[PDB]
Amino acid sequence: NWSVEDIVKGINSNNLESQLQATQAARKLLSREKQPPIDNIIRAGLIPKFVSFLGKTDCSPIQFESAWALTNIASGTSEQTKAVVDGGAIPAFISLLASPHAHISEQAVWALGNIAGDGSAFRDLVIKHGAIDPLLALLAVPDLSTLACGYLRNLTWTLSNLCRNKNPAPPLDAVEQILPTLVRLLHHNDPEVLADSCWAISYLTDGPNERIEMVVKKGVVPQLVKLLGATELPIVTPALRAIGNIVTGTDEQTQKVIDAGALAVFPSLLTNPKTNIQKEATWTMSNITAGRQDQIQQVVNHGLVPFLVGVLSKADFKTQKEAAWAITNYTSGGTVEQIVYLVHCGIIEPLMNLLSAKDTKIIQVILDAISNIFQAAEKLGETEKLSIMIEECGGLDKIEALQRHENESVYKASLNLIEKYFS
């Protein structure tokens, strides 16, 4: 390839063809090397020139080459992305969305996706410059299957970045404007379009219940549940994140997930070979057992309590901690008979074994659960029998062991449980 010095000499020539060849040499440098010399290109002052080339409608080749070069600069660090924005790229790329040449319009889509992907400020600045209307207009066809596959994938990914991040969340009216197109993309059968559409939905559902509501009322939950059962891990991961986000909301929002059949997938989610799936699925379960006692009953009816015993028994510790929360929540909201069923499934022994964990919060979660189970036992006339089970699990004397424990917090029930039940 060319040196940066030669690229600079060609771009400074004021000869449009010499500038085109130098811009192509810059794009090859920026797209071929690993460790492309982005900072050298920026320090040479080339970004304003590339941005001006985006406006040369009489030379579509140099529009494409400079769009590609700027895309890759914008894919770098936040400082490198800011250099592109500072050079006036945002409104120049938005104008290029109207190009008659699909390869040029898609490169502008890509560049705006990298700029928006930097964070909420540049995301919102891309929106303020008017990107959403022309982006959605590229998708306004009766059947998405008539669009080129790579083109559609790039549009979906850029739209997902406009749905990105949390502080703040994207403007409400932008979300409302994008959502119908996003729901179309969620139903499009291409694995990468589905993955990125799912990511967008997971972003939009991560936040307050009002944000969750505007997604749920578009009717997407049954489609998320279908995707929750896909074979592609890049689809299952964001679908599960979105389902998990939705059940952090109200009892009605949680009930839509259950009504759609999500619990039938959890036997495989809670045994999934990928640790991050098990953790995410067990966290979602803990927010479902924090629901109404008829929602707990659905967990029971789907046979999921043995799977929670399993995760509590053997799993990555972070997943085991989420399972302890699931149990405490269950014991906290469940009926006496639901708590009896939990004990009959073998919850006591794995729950006692985790009292040896060096994490302090799981000990407090587990001792809350033990407390909740004893009050159920009290209501039945039945307490002493529970106490017997605990000590044969070794759980008794690793409870006393916890009255030394540093926390005033673990101190409470450690003495409470013994004075009130054991001794």
């Binding site: 986000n245 059940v247 952090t248 909301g249 966290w283 927010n287 924090a290 929360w325 929540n329």
Partner: peptide, 7 residues
Amino acid sequence: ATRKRPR
């Protein structure tokens, strides 16, 4: 008085 836990 929710026991739901955020992400």
